[PDB]
Amino acid sequence: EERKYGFDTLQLHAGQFVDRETKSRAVPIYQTTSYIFETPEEAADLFALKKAGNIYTRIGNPTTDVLEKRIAALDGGVGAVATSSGQAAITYAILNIARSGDEVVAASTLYGGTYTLFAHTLRKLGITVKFVNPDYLEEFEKAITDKTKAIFVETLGNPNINIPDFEAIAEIAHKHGIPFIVDNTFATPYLFRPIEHGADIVVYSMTKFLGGHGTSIAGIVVDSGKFEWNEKFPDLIQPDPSYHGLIYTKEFGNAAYIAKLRLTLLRDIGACLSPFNSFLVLLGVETLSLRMQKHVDNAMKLAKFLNDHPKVEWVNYPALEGNKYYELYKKYLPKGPGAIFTFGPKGGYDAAKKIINNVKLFSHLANVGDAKSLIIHPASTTHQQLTEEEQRAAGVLPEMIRLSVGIEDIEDLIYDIESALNK
Amino acid sequence: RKYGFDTLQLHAGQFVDRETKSRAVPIYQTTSYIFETPEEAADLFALKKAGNIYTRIGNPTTDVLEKRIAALDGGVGAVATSSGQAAITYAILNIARSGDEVVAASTLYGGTYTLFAHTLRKLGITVKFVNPDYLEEFEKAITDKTKAIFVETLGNPNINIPDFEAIAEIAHKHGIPFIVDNTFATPYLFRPIEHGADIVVYSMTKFLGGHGTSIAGIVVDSGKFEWNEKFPDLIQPDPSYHGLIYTKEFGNAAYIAKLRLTLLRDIGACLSPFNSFLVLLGVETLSLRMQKHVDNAMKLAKFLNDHPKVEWVNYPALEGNKYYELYKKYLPKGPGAIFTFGPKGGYDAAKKIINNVKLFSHLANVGDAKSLIIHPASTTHQQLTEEEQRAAGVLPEMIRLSVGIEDIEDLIYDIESALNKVLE
Amino acid sequence: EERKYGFDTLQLHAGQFVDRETKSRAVPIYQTTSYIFETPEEAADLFALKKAGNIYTRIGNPTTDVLEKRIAALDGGVGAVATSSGQAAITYAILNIARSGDEVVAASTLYGGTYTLFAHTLRKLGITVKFVNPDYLEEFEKAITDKTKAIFVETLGNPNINIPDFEAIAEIAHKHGIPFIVDNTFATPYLFRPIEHGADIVVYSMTKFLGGHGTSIAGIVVDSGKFEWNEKFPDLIQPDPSYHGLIYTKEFGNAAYIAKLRLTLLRDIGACLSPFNSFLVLLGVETLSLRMQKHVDNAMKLAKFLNDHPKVEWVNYPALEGNKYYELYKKYLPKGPGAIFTFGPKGGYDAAKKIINNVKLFSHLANVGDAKSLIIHPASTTHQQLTEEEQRAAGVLPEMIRLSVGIEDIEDLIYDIESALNK
Amino acid sequence: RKYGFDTLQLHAGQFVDRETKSRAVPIYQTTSYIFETPEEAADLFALKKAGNIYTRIGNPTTDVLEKRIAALDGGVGAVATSSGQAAITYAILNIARSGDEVVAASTLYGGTYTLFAHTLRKLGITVKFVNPDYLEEFEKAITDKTKAIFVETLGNPNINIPDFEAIAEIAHKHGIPFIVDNTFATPYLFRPIEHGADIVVYSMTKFLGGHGTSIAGIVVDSGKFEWNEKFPDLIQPDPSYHGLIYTKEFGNAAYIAKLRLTLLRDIGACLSPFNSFLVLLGVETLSLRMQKHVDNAMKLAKFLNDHPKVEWVNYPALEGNKYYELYKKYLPKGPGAIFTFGPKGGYDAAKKIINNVKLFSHLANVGDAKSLIIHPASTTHQQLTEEEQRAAGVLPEMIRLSVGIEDIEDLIYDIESALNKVLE
Numbered sequence A, C: 001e002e003r004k005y006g007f008d009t010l011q012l013h014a015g016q017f018v019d020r021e022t023k024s025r026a027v028p029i030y031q032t033t034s035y036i037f038e039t040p041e042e043a044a045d046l047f048a049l050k051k052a053g054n055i056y057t058r059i060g061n062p063t064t065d066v067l068e069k070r071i072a073a074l075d076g077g078v079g080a081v082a083t084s085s086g087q088a089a090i091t092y093a094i095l096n097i098a099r100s101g102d103e104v105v106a107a108s109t110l111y112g113g114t115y116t117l118f119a120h121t122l123r124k125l126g127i128t129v130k131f132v133n134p135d136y137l138e139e140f141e142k143a144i145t146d147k148t149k150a151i152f153v154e155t156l157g158n159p160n161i162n163i164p165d166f167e168a169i170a171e172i173a174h175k176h177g178i179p180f181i182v183d184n185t186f187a188t189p190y191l192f193r194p195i196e197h198g199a200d201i202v203v204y205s206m207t208k209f210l211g212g213h214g215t216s217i218a219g220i221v222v223d224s225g226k227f228e229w230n231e232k233f234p235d236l237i238q239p240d241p242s243y244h245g246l247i248y249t250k251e252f253g254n255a256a257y258i259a260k261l262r263l264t265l266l267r268d269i270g271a272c273l274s275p276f277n278s279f280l281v282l283l284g285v286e287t288l289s290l291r292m293q294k295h296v297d298n299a300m301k302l303a304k305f306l307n308d309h310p311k312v313e314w315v316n317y318p319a320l321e322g323n324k325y326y327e328l329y330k331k332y333l334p335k336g337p338g339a340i341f342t343f344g345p346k347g348g349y350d351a352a353k354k355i356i357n358n359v360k361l362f363s364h365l366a367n368v369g370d371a372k373s374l375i376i377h378p379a380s381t382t383h384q385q386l387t388e389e390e391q392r393a394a395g396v397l398p399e400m401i402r403l404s405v406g407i408e409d410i411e412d413l414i415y416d417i418e419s420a421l422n423k
Numbered sequence B, D: 001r002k003y004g005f006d007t008l009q010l011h012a013g014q015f016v017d018r019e020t021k022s023r024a025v026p027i028y029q030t031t032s033y034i035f036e037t038p039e040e041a042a043d044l045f046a047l048k049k050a051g052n053i054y055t056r057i058g059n060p061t062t063d064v065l066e067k068r069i070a071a072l073d074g075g076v077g078a079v080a081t082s083s084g085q086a087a088i089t090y091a092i093l094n095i096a097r098s099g100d101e102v103v104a105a106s107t108l109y110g111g112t113y114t115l116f117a118h119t120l121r122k123l124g125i126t127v128k129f130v131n132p133d134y135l136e137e138f139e140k141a142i143t144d145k146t147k148a149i150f151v152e153t154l155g156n157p158n159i160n161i162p163d164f165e166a167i168a169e170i171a172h173k174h175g176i177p178f179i180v181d182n183t184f185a186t187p188y189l190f191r192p193i194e195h196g197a198d199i200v201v202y203s204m205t206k207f208l209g210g211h212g213t214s215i216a217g218i219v220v221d222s223g224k225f226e227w228n229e230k231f232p233d234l235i236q237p238d239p240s241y242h243g244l245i246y247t248k249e250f251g252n253a254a255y256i257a258k259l260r261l262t263l264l265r266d267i268g269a270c271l272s273p274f275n276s277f278l279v280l281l282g283v284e285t286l287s288l289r290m291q292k293h294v295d296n297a298m299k300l301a302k303f304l305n306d307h308p309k310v311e312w313v314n315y316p317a318l319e320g321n322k323y324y325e326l327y328k329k330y331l332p333k334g335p336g337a338i339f340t341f342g343p344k345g346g347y348d349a350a351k352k353i354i355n356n357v358k359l360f361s362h363l364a365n366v367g368d369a370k371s372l373i374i375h376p377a378s379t380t381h382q383q384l385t386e387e388e389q390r391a392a393g394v395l396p397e398m399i400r401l402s403v404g405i406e407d408i409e410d411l412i413y414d415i416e417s418a419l420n421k422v423l424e
């Protein structure tokens, strides 16, 4: 009769077992490549997948395992695989179910890096990502073909801060027998558990809020385990010749996708996470709810402040009255639609430049989801790779300042942004 | 006036940071870097200015290691990756897209083989495995889709030494780069770029890192390969960078620039700055470790080669080894520190030995300071078919030793004691 | 006209400057022993203290410097020196102003380790620590002699959870021209800034709440800079022969004590903190307010829960109605008297053993101030070194369970402790 | 059947953790460790049971390093500390209380000298500095309060080699331990315990760690010293442990047990598990690095010893060096890799050289892989009076080189180029 722990317990404990050797309370940093095999048979068994155990950190690492289990536990997934980066998580999440010739439907409202991965890198690997305006559920529907393997959206458009109608998009995905992949980087499980809202697979840049401290690039893929792998995902339901005819759904049941992702993509492409990074991201995850609550409390107040400020044209934050995504925010992200939002100063690009140049507390850097408040001009930075049209479709605007509202004293954030605005 | 290898392994790429004057390479365990101005942020993203943008793309700790490996290999630049697998993936994906082919030696690390045969196959990249013993096979396998020839310096675990220069001439004849996975040699024992490689990849996990702590890969660009129409993504405007042409913007660093700006940035198989730091600590002693590794490997290989309980020992430096002359030509300091042997009594004896060694670590790795042992057929190359294993030089009785820097007398004793427990 | 940032901003930003080299937003881990000297003159200048700069990590490290400045900024001190441990902080805090033949007055209500340091280790170095019942201000007064160099108390007795009357004890210390040293480990600057309440010197086990994640042993000494070093502290006001007649108060002004502590004790005894530890403790400090707020919110609810529980004899938490320290809690620790408190089950030692043995979420380990909830029986563990009398005086009791209430879901903590109590 | 040094430096103290089977030593960056039961917690605190209690007291990563250094030195045990200074402090404070004396060579690292002369003096410990050249001075300085003789293996920066065995006989005659700070040699070059040391201390910061990353110290207990009435705290009930007698509970490990249980626990100059991890990575290559260090040092010392712009070179392995025979006797592999030289043109030339070297790192450290240079009189020993500096063998013109593992040709070139810039 196992205990159902709360989020705040899970973010601290989940996936974390006291190692039998040292009884270390902290998750050891298993900064190891390798692990002893007690016997040839055990080694053969580990590689044959006949026995669970550590083989090689590229495949699996006991530090990272904590983080994987922890995020899976927070999202309510069966499993997760940490990656070297959000981008690697996204890459893996797609490549796990999409091969050359396959298609993915993605919101156009993506982080520039995902957009580029989708538009360019995956394109070159024969994966055609069809970008849809996520505001138009029919566009998901229209873009799906026999070749579509997934719908991919961000919980909160980097940096459109649009909230896809997850359950509606999930319905579309599931109607077509394809998984719904939600990049939940902007929300974290604390603000949004996409699995509860139809996501089959959640990915994160753990770089951002999950890690929370701007220290560690990291990604993770969380498998809901909810998705029935069908004939559109032959590699999940057919003998994998690289594992002597292992069938992921047969061997791993509902964990097929995440098992495959580890056994195929993590192992083969090796976008593995450093155990050190895992450890640092774990230290972030330990305070995730606390951070995220402060982040969203601050984001609300900063967004409300900017929303009423006479030198600000607009503020794009779902929680602001009259935001297009307000009701989606209330439905899906009731704790607050993340802590990243955009605003357009009066004076446009030139005012934006001046603001970004005159904030002293906001950190002008390429990141979101640091405990520290971050500012950037997506058009020239995060989404610089996108064509004007792709930027436009990603919700990028020339005057747009993106704020990742940190957990600083809101009064300081307001003061900082106010002082910058008054210059 | 160039610094010697031993100096470079300690110093190359490592600058005293202007802030702290740290002698050690700081662990810049950061995601992000301040942009002084919106103009600077724009310039950085527009590649108008060098600087730190985001650790997925580049990191000053990792930069040291990249520059250092690039310096040791005599490459223009390098990009570190989360793993050797990612380095290999990136090395290929940088220049191969769906529809493309790569010619690879069959004598690969199982994981590379599997990446090539399966994962890349799913990305529309057909790796054609050739028998690297036969230069004609490289030539034969090349098509107008081939984008590279890929070999390991010393096949994991065949310990074959491709005829690098001859293979390089084939690649180059075909206007394709020769990629050498130099994991087993490190630049100390072999600098593939001096022998026709255009691109070197390492699992820095192995000897470069040397301590079994850190998964890491790197791709080193020789800078020598003239990217041609077979690599449009290097010589044609990149729509992801507003029609940047890598060869135009980066000259000889086109490949490695692209690899960072496209694959590292997009797929994000980035190395942890901490891993970079640890690998650096390995690299600092690379020549010392590798010299000891090879001194030990030779002794152990000689010991086992003479041993009444050992059927065979496969190490190029052993008299009569097929690859002996290639070892003399290409790895004169010693053909790495990994070799295989087959005990008399075959697989069963192999298991007894692996079970009986106390000092050798039974684990999946090579190129630890620690002596490692494994049975590749059931582990490292377990994913391969019998045929693939055979083509990879994996044999059922085969024990792979990664000869560490322990006291050779202990390693000999350990293996001797284990052997001397297997009945005649 | 520099900005007065809030606590939450400071815990994130204070002491942290973007390095000119890399512009890293995260505090680099300057895991270096050494630092380049541009010139013999610069090296000579650094060692002669004619120039600030990095010399050697044992003395100073730019990662640790952030943490030092940050804690100094949170406490409102002029400076801090991080140490390898709380114990080293305490050792240094004392040895910086007390030599063989000198005395210190300390509350008997100490962490066993401090008690032992005081009672034994310092005794052997000719420093006689006179232990007073801190409930009796007259006892501080009585125990002070010509030889007394300091009064030392914990903000919240480990594990008595007594609150000394800081300002009253400060008055006694200052009346005798000796500094008041407050071990603020249990509170952190978030709950209590001893410098605002008469402490001249604050020490912490940063191991505990400041670090917050149970990863890193670390201590720090924070100098208020408020204390006028007088003839009782010759080494602060007279030429230091180890620095060619440097006078700390002359060279360092109000930072004399902390400067000396670095230049003499840190340098000479070298209880220095790893830059890595500094980095990890910084990651804790970044969420300090958030953690501490959750900790105290949980501690209150758990203490209130245990305080009403029919299998609990007593709960010692200042914030519980009728606790002796309630008004001291309201005066000094209004945000909550830390998140560590003790309770005596009914059934005494035997029930305590059973509880400690049957908690599944509480971690039975020697630490406090982890994000994770911790449990231990001080009498047999943290204070095991103390004689029955010293334990008694430290507020240790045979039936006493000490809880470090973590930031888990209070419902889980309650459930855990309730389930343990019902066994 | 003992493992060789090279094996021990890689393996000693390192066990495969039962949980993960990590080959690498995990970084147990933990404060705390679960007690399975209140009984277990009680037993651990009551020292009825070995196990992990709290990282200030003991840590499984650090344990590896402690055991490893203890293994390399042939000690019973070791306790790592935050620094060499803390190791020295602990080594002394473990056996000296206020009122006690220590006899130390004057030829000390400035920081030790200063700890001894000032910090310990404030704790009522009178360190009597003797001229280690003259065995009689050790004898003369000993009083019934002396608790130890303390010397460095190779004086920082006098590079004098005490006559360890002769000094050990003096200490032992007086029933006091001989503590050798073996920082400059490491167990690879000198195992003081084999030459009469009872306690060895290191700055692991230096050669043991070898990479300039991590401040660390260790105290190694030979286990050989029979604690007597001059050490009541080792042979009398410890009131802090309910009358535990260290010699009774820990036998030959009394000292090192006490040091952990009293000084480490109470003063908490504990090493970061991360530092332990990094130092371990150094130690893994200790023999390799130290061999290269000494090979390089000899070459550099010979180069400078023959150099027309160098007045003197102080390195025991140089023909005519006062300590040559002691080098032959005690450090036959080479008297460490730190030496001094005085350029012709004295201090001014010294500054020119220090300013002019490009490869040598001007910084305060020794025993980095990197070659280091400094002017001790103005840096490392700056805190000492002229007299103390002189008694420490510090000279105004003196340049201390910590000869790294760079290519000797680069180091020679670097110093040659710098010298050849100083006018005759």
Ligand code: NA
Binding pocket: A357, A358, B035, B036, B037
């Ligand atoms: Na600016």
Ligand code: NA
Binding pocket: A038, A039, B354, B355, B356
């Ligand atoms: Na076995």
Ligand code: NA
Binding pocket: C357, C358, D035, D036, D037
């Ligand atoms: Na139990």
Ligand code: NA
Binding pocket: C038, C039, D354, D355, D356
């Ligand atoms: Na200079």
